[PDB]
Amino acid sequence: GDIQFGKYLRLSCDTDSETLYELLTQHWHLKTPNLVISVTGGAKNFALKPRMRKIFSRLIYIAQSKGAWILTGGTHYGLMKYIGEVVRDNTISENIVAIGIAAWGMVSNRDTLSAQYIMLYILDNNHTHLLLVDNGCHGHPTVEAKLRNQLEKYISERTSQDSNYGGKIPIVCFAQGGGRETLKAINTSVKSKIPCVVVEGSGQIADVIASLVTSSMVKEKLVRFLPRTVSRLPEEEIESWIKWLKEILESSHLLTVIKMEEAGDEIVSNAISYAL
């Protein structure tokens, strides 16, 4: 069904990325000079920090300039809603392309079809494109991460001659919020050789990685960054978090961290260019 209040499509998890990319390229979207994915995290409330706003404004401006694809969760609650609102504002002012990928089961209201979705999770209507994964139907745990990672890896495998970047289209992961899902996404991106940029100074896991960029120090940083999260998390959760931290830090050159001191203009662009 097409949400109107863009295009929302329900696709199974076991879907070949090649077919989706061919569909998008043939008649829906043009070749993408750049592609950036943002992992907001489990939290549905995004704190409008003094610095995060400018960072993401610069990110969206860069994406518009380069005609990039912005991938997010698409949830109307949290950072994704802010990104969608900023995309709509820029559109009101070359078209920006935003894809929100989520799980159909977690969606609160399901409308089948040109059915219109009008306001359990809620998705932002600002996003121009949306994808709903459905393998564990009516399943609380998130399952879109696998498809997102597979699609990102396939797009990395692609090759565009027009782009100045040699061969494959550039892809940059982004991490501003903390959470287990964010850490898993960072691990998958690192295993995929696609660089990720972590916003140091904001978020729990992001700041932990920034400080790391051993095991006891990692645990102490994780506890300090998210006291409530570490207190609620069990010992097995802490062990898994430390394992993922060690796995991601094994490849430091890929990950890039924005310095807390660095707060000038065009810092996001500089960091992304350095990572690429």
Partner: peptide, 10 residues
């Protein structure tokens, strides 16, 4: 067309 393409894809 578009509906047929979507059905073929899935």
């Amino acid at each position: 067309d578009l509906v047929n393409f979507i059905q073929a894809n899935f």
